[PDB]
Amino acid sequence: SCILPNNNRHQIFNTTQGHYDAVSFIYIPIDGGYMSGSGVVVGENEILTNKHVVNGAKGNPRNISVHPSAKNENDYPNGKFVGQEIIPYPGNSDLAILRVSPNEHNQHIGQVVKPATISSNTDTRINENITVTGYPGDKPLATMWESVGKVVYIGGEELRYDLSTVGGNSGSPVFNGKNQVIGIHYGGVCNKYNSSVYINDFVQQFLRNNIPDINIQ
């Protein structure tokens, strides 16, 4: 996750408004600190994020806290949901489904926010205007930031763009202008581009296979 020449980013304060509500903050304690990342609610009990993010839990999903619509370190408007099962993408992309437990009120994560709409990606192209929204670690903890830019590359399961991200953004949803998820940010090449897992037909099948209620448009 790299700061690029295009560094056009702003904080989301109304984090439950519109498509921002499914954007999720991830906190995993380690002995002596914490790993944080990002994700997006896509199903009744499911978020999407990276393999390397959930790996911070060292195989134990109950080390993972998911805070949908997190606004800041003292403001979690939807509380948190604890990891229950890690379902990695069988292919070679840095993509994982995290299934989470209900909360203390027996609410499911996909009930307290609107699950994100997944693009079928039939129209996605080079140079289209997009956003990557999540929890960059150069900002205050658990604050949501949107980063504005353009697609520069599409290939197999990789989509690249020219917009800035930072450690902490891993797992952030990539949104098109219709606020649909076209990919899942995972990293980049500093300071050439940033990159996401592209939700192509094979990744879409993995999603539907594991999240039958998924909303693909």
- Domains of the chain by range and CATH? 1-15+117-217 (2.40.10.10), 16-116 (2.40.10.10)
Buried b (16+ CB within 10 A) or exposed e, 119-156: bebeebeeeeebbbbbbbbeeeebbbbbbbbebbebee
Could you give the residue ranges of the DSSP H alpha helices within 79-200?
109-112
In this structure, are residues 63 and 29 in contact, taking their beta carbons and an 8 Å threshold? yes
- Looking up tokens 């899942």 gives 184
- What tokens were used for 37? 């990342």
In this structure, are residues 150 and 127 in contact, taking their beta carbons and an 8 Å threshold? yes
- Looking up tokens 């380690």 gives 30
Neighbours of 54 (CB within 10 A): 27
- What tokens were used for 198? 């592209």
| CA distances for 212 relative to 54, 106, 204, angstroms | 22, 21, 11
Phi, psi of 208 (to 5 degrees): -60, -35
Catalytically active residues are 52, 94, 170
The identity of residue 92, as a single letter, is N
Which of 45, 69, 182, 82 minimizes the C-alpha distance to 134? 69
| CA distances for 117 relative to 33, 60, 73, 162, 173, angstroms | 34, 28, 27, 23, 11
- Three-class DSSP category at 165: coil
Long-range contacts of 80-89 (CB under 8 A, 24+ apart): 80/27, 81/109, 83/54, 83/57, 84/45, 85/61, 86/54, 86/57, 86/59, 86/61, 87/210, 88/51, 88/54, 89/51, 89/197, 89/203, 89/206
| CA distances for 153 relative to 85, 195, 202, 203, angstroms | 32, 9, 18, 18
